[PDB]
Every structure is written in C-alpha cells, then in structure tokens.
Amino acid sequence: HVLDVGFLPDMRAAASLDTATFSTTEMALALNRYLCLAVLPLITKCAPLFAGTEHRAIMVDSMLHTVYRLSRGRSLTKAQRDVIEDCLMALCRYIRPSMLQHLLRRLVFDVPILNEFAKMPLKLLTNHYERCWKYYCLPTGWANFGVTSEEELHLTRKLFWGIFDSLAHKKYDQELYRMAMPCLSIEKRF
Amino acid sequence: PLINQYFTNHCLYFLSTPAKVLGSGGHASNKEKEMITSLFCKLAALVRHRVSLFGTDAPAVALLPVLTTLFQHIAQHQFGDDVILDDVQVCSIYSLGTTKNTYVEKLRPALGECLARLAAAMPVAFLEPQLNEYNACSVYTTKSPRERAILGLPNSVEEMCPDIPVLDRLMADIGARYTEMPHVIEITLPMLCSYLPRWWERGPEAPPPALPAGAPPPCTAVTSDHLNSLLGNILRIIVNNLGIDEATWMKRLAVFAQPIVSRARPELLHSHFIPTIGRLRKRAGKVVAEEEQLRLEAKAEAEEGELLVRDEFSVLCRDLYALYPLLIRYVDNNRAHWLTEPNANAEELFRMVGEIFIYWSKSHNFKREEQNFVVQNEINNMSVATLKKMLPIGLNMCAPTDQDLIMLAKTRYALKDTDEEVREFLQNNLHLQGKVEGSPSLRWQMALYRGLPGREEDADDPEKIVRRVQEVSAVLYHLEQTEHPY
Amino acid sequence: LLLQTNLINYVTSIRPNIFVGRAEGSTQYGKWYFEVMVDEVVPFLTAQATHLRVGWALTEGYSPYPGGGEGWGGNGVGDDLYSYGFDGLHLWTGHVARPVTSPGQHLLAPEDVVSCCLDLSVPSISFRINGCPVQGVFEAFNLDGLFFPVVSFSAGVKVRFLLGGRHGEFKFLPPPGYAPCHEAVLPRERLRLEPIKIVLPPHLERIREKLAENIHELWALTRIEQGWTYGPVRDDNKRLHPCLVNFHSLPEPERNYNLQMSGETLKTLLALGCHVGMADEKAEDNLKKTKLPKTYMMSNGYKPAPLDLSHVRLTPAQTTLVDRLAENGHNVWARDRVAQGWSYSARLVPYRLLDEATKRSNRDSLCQAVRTLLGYGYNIEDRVRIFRAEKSYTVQSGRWYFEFEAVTTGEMRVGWARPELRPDVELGADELAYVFNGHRGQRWHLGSEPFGRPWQSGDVVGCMIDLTENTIIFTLNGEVLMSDSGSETAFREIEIGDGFLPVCSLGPGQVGHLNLGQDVSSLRFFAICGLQEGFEPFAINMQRPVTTWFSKSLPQFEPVPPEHPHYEVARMDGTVDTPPCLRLAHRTWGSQNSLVEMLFLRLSLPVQFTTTYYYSVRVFAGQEPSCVWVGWVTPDYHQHDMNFDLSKVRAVTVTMGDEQGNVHSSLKCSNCYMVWGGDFVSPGQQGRISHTDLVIGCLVDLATGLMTFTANGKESNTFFQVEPNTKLFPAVFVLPTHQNVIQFMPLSAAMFLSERKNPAPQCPPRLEVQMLMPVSWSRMPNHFLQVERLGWAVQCQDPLTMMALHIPEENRCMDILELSERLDLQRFHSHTLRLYRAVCALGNNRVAHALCSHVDQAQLLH
C-alpha cells in the first residue's frame, strides 16, 4: 500500500496555483489519513521510505494553495505520529527543517515542523546513535536555532518553547570522522 | 536565553571527571564567569532555578593562565559578608526575602578543584557573625535557623585551626611545615562546644529555642575529621547525639524541629554494640517510650464505639501528631547492627534479646486505624514503602530468628500449630497440645544444621514456646498486608 | 563402526617458569641446555606402563586437559605438533612412535639423566642419553612462541630438575654455547615449577643548549664534591672517571657522550604530540634560592648548590612521558649492546619489563631533567573460562543459594543460567543468563546495567534465586545488594522456563572459589539472609562433589547446524550429467562477515598399509608438485578453509576422475584456499605459512642414511591466485587427486568401505559438511593427580585412572561421563551394550569368548 497508494500524494503535491479546481483529491486524501495514522508498521524499515517522509513534509508546508486548516491539522497529526514508526533514517527529512524551518522565523508553517523537531530529541536523548549526515546537520541547525530565536522572535511562550530544547542526538561510539568545516575550539563553540 | 542555557547544563555537566580529568579546568572556569553578571539582575519572574543548577555541577592544577577567574577568587567572599552583617539587625522581612540568594553560593561540599585562598576567612566571615544570632536576641521565632546546618558546610573548609585568625595576621601576611604543627590545636573548641548541649536536659523545646539550629554542624563535621590519628573523637561523638536525643522520649517534644534534626544526621559510626554497648539499653528505653503510642489507639477506640461521642475531632486527633514523626531515625539503629546481630545471634542467644522483646507493638497495635499515619505522612507517600511497613524490616530477620529450638524444627512446627487465627486468650491452648518434629526432612545436612553448632547451649524451655507462640502470630497480621493493599 | 572403551591413566606435565624465544631483536643468545634426572621405581603400576617423557613446548600446545586426548587418553607431551618429547627411545611428534638407534635402548630406568639442547640459528632439538647421542633428530619447526622446559609423567614418577645456577650439578658438561640460567631468567620474577595452562630553528638550538648546560653543570660539581678521587697509584681497573672535568671545555669524547642524550631528549619530546608554548612565564623569575646552613662548605672548594625544585612539582602525567622516553633510550642502548657487545657478564635484556627498581631509576634519570626544565620555566604540556554444573542438576522450583569467593578482583561474573548456555558468548550477553559483574558494579542480562558496589579482595559474594517468587537477590558479605531504582536486585518477572543452573566465569588472570554447599560448614555466613527465609542452599543432599562442567578452549569440529543464520548449505542431488555437489550461502547484508571459516568433511581417508606416496593437487593441469606425503595410514579429512567474501557460493562437488578419486571444490569470486586436513587440526585464523613442524630426520650411526620429509603436513595451502592472472572473475575448479586403487575412481568408494568396487560418485547422508567451532563444553574430573623442594624435585605417588570412550572415525578420546550430558551417544552406547548382550545370547559361549576381547574383566569391574 505504501508503494501503490503512496504514489498518489507525490503526484498530488504538485498544486500551488495552477489547479485551483482539483481539490477533490486533496479532500479524498485528507479524509483518508486515518489509515496511515492508525498504524505503526515498518519498524524494520528495510525499504527506503525517506521519499514518503519528504513528501509528507512537503504537504505539511504546502499551505500556498487551499489548505483546509482542519485537514492541515490532520496532516500535522499524521506526520507527527509517523515519527515513531521509523528508526531514524530520514536524513533528507531531518535536514529539510534546517533548510526551511530553521531558516524561516516561524513565518507560516515553521511552528508545526518545529514541534516535531523539538519532540525528536525527547526520544533521541541517550540513544539513537548519529551518523555522518546527522552529526553534521546537528551543530549548524542548533546554531541557527540558538541565534535566530533569542532576539527577533516574539514573546509567545509556546513559540519560545516550540524550539527551546537541548537538541543533542549524540551517539554512544561515534558518528562522523570527517574534517570539521566551520566555513567551507570546542570550548568556544557553545 | 535563560531556560535553554540552564537545560543544556543538566546533561553536559559531569564531563570533567571521566573525560579530560585534568584538561577540563579551562572549560569549567569559563562558564562560571558569566553566571555572576546575573547577581544584580532582579526580575518579577523567578529565575532562581537556573542559579542553583548552574553552580551545582560547575566544578564537576597551576595551568590556568587565561583563567581570569583567578581574579574572581575574592569576588565570592565579597557577597558572603554583605547579607550576614546587614541581617544582624534583622517582621515582614524576617524571612527568606533576603536569604534567598545565599543557598547557591555556599553549597560546594565535594566538587573542589580551586583553592581561591579562602581558607580561614569563612569561619570568621559569616560563621562568627552568625554566632551573634545564635541566642534569643530578643527577637521572634527564627525564620531560617536550619541554614546554619545547610549553608555551614560540614568541615568543607580544607583547614581548621583556632587562634589563627585573631592572632596570626601579619605572620601569613609577610609570607615547609604547614597544617602539621596544629596537630593538637584542632581539638580546642570541640572539647568545649560539645560540653554545653550535653549537660542540657530540659524537657520542653521552648527552653532550647534555637539550640537545635546549631547542634548538627559541629559534631557531624569533626567526627569525620582527624580520623587517622585520634579515634577517640569519633568514639565520644556517638555519645554526643545519644545523650541529646534522650529529650525526644516525651510524647510531645517538637512538631517541626523533630523531623528537621532527625533527618539532619541519621548517622552512627561508633554507636553499635562494640563501640557503645549501652546504646542497646539506651535505645531499649526508647522502645518502652514508643510503646505508649499503642495505648492511645486502643484507649480512644473504646470511646469511639457506635459514635457515641464526637469522634470526628477527639478519637482520631490523638496519635497522628506524635507517633508518626518519632520513628524516622530508629530504623538505622538495627540496620547497622544487623550486620553483626545474627552473627552474634549465631554466637549466642543474648545478642538481640531486647530487640526481639521490643518492636512487636509497632505492628501489633497498628493493625487498624492506619489512616492516622498516612495523614501525618503526607510529605512522603503523596508523591508502598511506608515507614510503618518497614518497621519490622530489621526485626523479621532477627526477632523470629532466636525464638526457641535454634535447630530442632520446633519453630516451623509451632508456626503451623498456631496458624489458626489464634486469639490472645486462646494462645495458651497451643501450649497444651504440642507440635514438634524430629523428622528425617531437610533438617538433614543444611536446614537446622547451623543451629546446633551455633547453639552451644541451646536453651529450650516449655515456657519458651510462649515466646515462639507470639512470633508467628505477628506474621499472621503481616500476612494480609501484602494482599490487602493492592 | 562402534565406540570403544578401556581404562586409561591420567598424565600431567609440569614445567619451571622458564621462557625462551627468538625474534628479530633481543634473544638472550636463544640457545639453552636443559638437564634433569629421574627417580622412579614403578615399571608397571596398576593399570598399564607408566608414561614419562621430556622435551620442549612452544607456549601454544595447551596439551594437559585431564581426560580427553587426541588418541587414547590425556597424553602428556609430544602427542601433538605443538610439543616435542623423548621417553628413552621415541620421537613423539603428533602421535608418532618412531624410535631411534642408541646404545642401551631402555626406558627411563632409575638413576638415568637426560640432556636437552635447543639451537636458535637452525631450528634443531637434540637429546643426550645417559652416555650416548641420538642417531636421528627432528628439525624445521616453528619458532613463534616461548619454548617451555616441560616434563610429562604418569603416576609414580619422581624427577629432579637441574639448573646449574644453584643446585644443577650437571653430569654431562654443558655444550659449547648454551647458558643455563646465567645472565637473566625472569628478570621481574623468580624460579618455580608450574603446571602448564643548513638552516635550523634557533628555538631548538637555544632550548637544547640551556637544557644541556643546566643538566651537565651538576655532574662536575657532584663528582668533585663527592670526593671519589683516584688513589696515589695509577689503576686502570679502578674505574677511573675521565668525566671529572669542566662542563664547558669538556673534550670531544665527552662532547659526543653528552650529544647523544641531549639530542635524544628533544627527538623524543618532539614525537610525543605535546604543544610547544610558554604556558605561564612564572618559574623564570620566581626562582628562589632555598636556605642552606653553613655546613654545605666542603674542603674540595665546590659547595653543593643545586637549583631549587623542592616546591616545583608539575603533575604525574608528564612522568609517563618521561618513563616512556627512558624506556625508549634504554631499549636503544640494549639494541646497540646486543648488536656488538656479546658480553658474558651477569649483560642485560629488554628493560621494558625488567624490574621495578632499575626501571624507576631509569625514569627518574630523565625526571630530573624534566623537573629542571620546568623550574627554568620552559615547560611543555585469550577468552574467558565458564564453569557450571551439569544439566542433570537443573532445578525447577524452590529457593536456592551458594557463595562465590573473589580472590582476585578483575573480570569475574556470578549468576544463574538456563541449561543451554551457549559458550563462546560473554556471560549475560543474552537472555540465557542472569548474572552480576563485580569489576564495575554492574549487573548483566541482555546488556549491562549498573547495580551495587564493585568487589574487593576475598569479598565472598552470595547469589540467590527464588523460583516461587521469580526473584534473584545477590548478597555481598552478608549484606543484601541494593539497586539504584529502589528495588532489591531487580530481575523481576523471570519465568520458570526449563529450570536454572548456577554458572560462573573467569577472565584472564583471575582466581575464583565457589562453594555450592556440598558440606555444611564451608559456607561463609548463611545466617543473615537465608537462615529462616526459606532460602536454602544448592547441595542440600549430595554424597559426591557436584560435577561443575567447564568450558573448553580447543577448537573442535562441529556439524553445520541447518538453522545457522548466515551459513546455509545444500545437498544438491547428483545427476547423470553432473556429479553430486554441495554449496554454501551467506546473509550478504550488514550481518557478520566472519573470518576464514574452516570447513570439514564427515568421514576419513586412511591411506593403505602406501600406493600413493604423494598427492596431486590440480587446478586445471599439473599444479605445484611435491604435495606433502606421509606414506602411512594417516586418515585425511578434506578441508575447505574458505574466506567469506560476501559472495554467492564456494561450492564442493564429489566428482570422479578417469582412474582416481578426486574432489571438485569450486569457487567463484575471491581468495579461498582448500586442501586436505589432518584429523587433529585445531588452529585459529590469521596465518598462511609455518603451520607444519617436526620434519623427520632419521639417520644411521654414521648420520648417512638420512631421509627427510615434510611430516605432519596438515594444511598444505594452495594459493590458487598464483594460477590465473586476469582482470576478471571466472570460476576456478580445483580438483586435487589422491585416491589410487586398481581400476582395470570417486571419493566415496574408498572412504565408505562398502561400495568400493562401485565407481559411481555418491554422497550418503553420513557425509555432512562441518565447520570449526572455537569453544565447546567439557567435564571437570572429580579427582586429579596429587602432585617439592631441595632442588624443586616433583614427587608423585597416587595412582589415578578413568575409563574412556573413543570415536574411531574422528579419532579422539573422551571421558565416558560426558554421556551424562550428551544424551545422543549415551542412547547409542546403551543400545550397543544391548547388542553385545543379544549377540552373546542364551546358551552361547564362543561369542562370549570373542566379547571378552572388546571388553575386559578389569573394565567391567571398574
């Protein structure tokens, strides 16, 4: 099903201002997000499903067309609950918020992504050994979050706590041995 | 930037010890410097939580040249004298309004990495000014008298010696035998400081209004100190608190000072039988005093029958206030002695005759009206491991151990004989029927095979069956406790 | 076809703690002479001929395991290739009983002496009979390991070791060039018998000059103030000191003498990874001259005025670098001395582990230099054994307890376990164990978990189990251990399963004593936590000591389990167009890519009588000739020491040659060498050459009738990759040929003894491919040999013997009692006893006479 049905949302993602009439597929998929929400399969996750996660994040951030805010919340719930059925391989989906959500100052849809971004270290603390991509994306994203949120953000307590976390998916043995690239000293970093 | 800065300090705190044991000096000192700029800041929202957390784990040799905190060594002592000296005069502000900033500064008990040349100033900086307010001072009830035991560290000063600060000023000012000549100069105050409270034997807590606020710090501290040379100070230190606690024998001594000091020093190192033989009878007398609580529940129960009187505020209002706080500290007495008592019980039956003869009424009378303890234990169980339930924790390993017939199988046979919900009056019936077994059972090589070698003089009497007749009966009431609580 | 039995004597070997090895480096002359005399009065003890023989052992034999042996019983020494021995007339190398020619061909009669000599240049071991030499000795063996002086002996043999140093009165003179414990033997230990098993940076110039001047200014003053001046006479052997000169105008020899150490200091400091920088700039100006009472003046005119360092102590860290530099310097000095010195003096050996005092002095020699530099200111920053009772003692319910004493405080574990505890797995690493570790105060079950305080010396730890309440509560010296979560030793919700069984493990260099309560009084406390709680010890009623099976170390052969995760074989049916073949498989994923997996065939190939005298390994034509030959019976197992390369297959096919029986061990991807294998091969991995030793060197009285051969050639590896040379990967079909009969052809016909005349290839189900597992289980004998001063002579008198099984196909002994846990050969042996009784049926007595040969009166009585 994730191969056959899951192909349909990828095609359906291509709707920003050109369709404006074919909202029937949007409601058809929105009213049938319970099927994916109601299960926690693929703990093994042998097949690469990072594409599905990327598409889900796209439709989460695809608020430019009609969004149907109730369906928007349904998609948010589906994406948030899908973060439990994977064994932390969605490297592209992990770096996407750094490129999009971290860059955005909670403009339109950055807060829903930041909610899951802050929820991830709760299960990733003292476990979830990092990789090369994870260890490389951790400090840049952490620095962006810890520089962007301090001053130019608002005074909203929920918005402040929406990104306020230690956010350290540190491993037990090691994650990466590539040359550190400040632009291409651990005491001065933090 | 306050909450996130404090939160990341919880995890990356102990990084000094396992990794970079000596190379972590620059990191720890660097963080502490920025934590001082918040001392002036006053905010409507409470920010004290990050203050204690930051300094709690910040400490976690001479190679610290970039450490400007070398110049910050005198900075910490600067705020020490500010509050204490001003508070001597000190009502709306006779509370934690001005002392809320002193808890984070003082608490540095174990993690010591820097010296800061603050060796003997502290005993004179705040402790001696704090001695000014030790007595009544013609002031109302003290707001935070326990800060002396808390903020006053137990000999975490790296050096103690009298007559140095008041006489040796220019000698150290001008500037390799050090801390060795005053090998006997240390014992000048304890020989006098301990003499005052011990002679004090008043009943009510009012005549000692502020006495409990100063008793813990000295005895607990110096008992550890100087253990290498003089073991006598540790020996008499056990007697020091033993005598003072005799005033706790009264059913109503303290309702707020009793728990604070009981948990202040639940420590005994030389109070066991070998160091302090009299502590057994000293605590045995406390057992008799503790038994008086049992009569309260039984006496008030008769009047509570059929709700003839106002039992709402009369029957229940008696035992909860007194019984519950007392028994916090008696548990450690048998726990420490439990390492030797069964071995001493194996050596002879007289090891814990008094202990076996006592602590029975703790559960004997508390079969019913258990709510009297729960209400007084609101601080504990509100949030299973009730202190009342763990009262026979040391007793169940000793009290039924030496009952009678050390290795004769009569113990199990007697328990089976009385396993009939036997009433107290009916307990005499089992003494006339008898139940013994010289079986070829597991008494063969291992069970009941320690006892005869361990009982060189196995005293067994027909009357001693009565002594064993009570051990199993107590277990009958304790049998339902596990199943009933659910 | 049937298992055999007979009574067999226990044999054990002991050695003095002497080690001799050779390598590219320090060797201690690598040649030694060994002497020992005998004192026995027992030509024949109760069972059979008493066995004793002397020789060497290259620290990888591990021969003595009381009980199971390679042939019949636990032979002491010389029964394998990793040992060498001599018993009066024999060259014992791998169960080979070739004798030698020498006057007085007699055993070790009382009042006889033997001399053993070892040469390092040529690998050669020779023996000296009481008055005669040997007319044939073995050579061309391995040298990678220290060679023990070992003596093997049965019951009733007493021998006296001779060293030469203090009591070794050698009757024979030592040979020309062998030193019996003269220069250094165990430098950090003693002797005792043990049972076996143009532009340059001016920064560097100024630093070096200041260091050298500051350290050399002390020498002249010390030597002129100590007053150790020469006498009036001119004595050249009085150890005159030319260094008693000024530290500036010192001559060229003194210049060279100082230059080596001064340069080596900077050379070793620049390679330590330190950071060059002026850290504090404090000691340069804070040099305070300490007070000195006016007695320092001496008539020599040179007052002792050392630099003040009484308060300048840096840290114990850089002391490690100083010690490492000192060790490197003394190692270089030792290398130089060994290169040319050859001094016959009470000479030195590698100082890395020489002794505490000398090494400490060597470290301090540079510690003074380091401290002086700091005061100046320039400062710069194989496996684990497992033990358990036999499965028959598995307990299902109750409350059970025992005590473990931890003499050493290293890696040791204690706990209970399921009966099917797989070896080769660290204790507690899976669900089949509930144990505790006291080296780190952590409990072990399916992973580590911190719990309780770690151990100390003695520290008798009690272990407990309550099958009724499913709780395991460890007790430490009479106090119950406590968990960090507020629970009492949290192993809660443990099901009954198939019952539980005590187990303990010991790491390297650890000593443990466990007491299962066979006798009441041996338990330490058992009166604080178990006396009245129903908690009742293990051996409540036993008339004999508990078996306590242990874990082997020798890598025996085991069949490939059809349930193995990533090793799947297949018995492809043999067709008309293709001979029967067997393949492999592997989980080519992130799974474990193991080492060279050694594969074996099931049955044997014993050569007749030889009719072969050689082997013919073939890849596609006549390959590397002169394949090793033995010309004896010597059953040979085909071996496939293939390397898992995450590839498809490394198959094997039972083909038929034109007129000879040959294998077809195909392979497709990468390096995998497969040749025959002996019936006693037990190697590890990581080795391709030098795995065959003890060549035959028999000769005549004139040393002229000498014939030699590559004896004991087990793994005659054929590196196939030398045959092809291409940038591709085609199939390689190696088909070695050895089977030779009259054909006027397959592998099975010769090795099954039934379809011998039939030449069609067959793979009957008796043939199963096996692998080589490293560790299996074994049974500890309930009785061992008993056994030593006045020259440390060994005295043994008590006799001890067991009755032992035998597997003719696999050719290896084993104690009969192992059948109490095997339960697969026990049933077969009971049925074969029933067959013996049936064939000795009612009213028959010829068959009874025949049967009194397979068994014996003494064996039945035992």
Curated annotation (Swiss-Prot), chain A:
Assembly description: Homotetramer. Can also form heterotetramers with RYR2. Identified in a complex composed of RYR1, PDE4D, PKA, FKBP1A and protein phosphatase 1 (PP1). Repeated very high-level exercise decreases interaction with PDE4D and protein phosphatase 1 (PP1). Interacts with CALM; CALM with bound calcium inhibits the RYR1 channel activity. Interacts with S100A1. Interacts with FKBP1A; this stabilizes the closed conformation of the channel. Interacts with CACNA1S; interaction with CACNA1S is important for activation of the RYR1 channel. Interacts with CACNB1.
Q: Which gene is transcribed and translated to give this protein?
A: RYR1
The family this protein is said to belong to: Belongs to the ryanodine receptor (TC 1.A.3.1) family. RYR1 subfamily.
- From the Swiss-Prot or TrEMBL record, state where the protein is found: Sarcoplasmic reticulum membrane
Summarize which stretch of the complete protein this chain spans.
2520 to 2955 of 5037
Provide the record's note on post-translational modification.
The N-terminus is blocked. Channel activity is modulated by phosphorylation.
What tissues is it present in? Detected in skeletal muscle (at protein level). Fast- or slow-twitch skeletal muscle.
Give the source lineage, highest ranks first.
Answer: Eukaryota, Metazoa, Chordata, Craniata, Vertebrata
The Swiss-Prot or TrEMBL note on domains reads: The calcium release channel activity resides in the C-terminal region while the remaining part of the protein constitutes the 'foot' structure spanning the junctional gap between the sarcoplasmic reticulum (SR) and the T-tubule. Pore opening is mediated via the cytoplasmic calcium-binding domains that mediate a small rotation of the channel-forming transmembrane regions that then leads to channel opening.
Organism from which the protein derives: Oryctolagus cuniculus
- Any further remark recorded for this protein: Binding of [3H]ryanodine indicates that the heterozygous channel is activated by Ca(2+) concentrations 4-fold lower than normal. Single-cell analysis of cotransfected cells shows a significantly increased resting cytoplasmic Ca(2+) level and a significantly reduced luminal Ca(2+) level.
**Role according to the record:** Cytosolic calcium-activated calcium channel that mediates the release of Ca(2+) from the sarcoplasmic reticulum into the cytosol and thereby plays a key role in triggering muscle contraction following depolarization of T-tubules. Repeated very high-level exercise increases the open probability of the channel and leads to Ca(2+) leaking into the cytoplasm. Can also mediate the release of Ca(2+) from intracellular stores in neurons, and may thereby promote prolonged Ca(2+) signaling in the brain. Required for normal embryonic development of muscle fibers and skeletal muscle.
This one is known as Ryanodine receptor 1
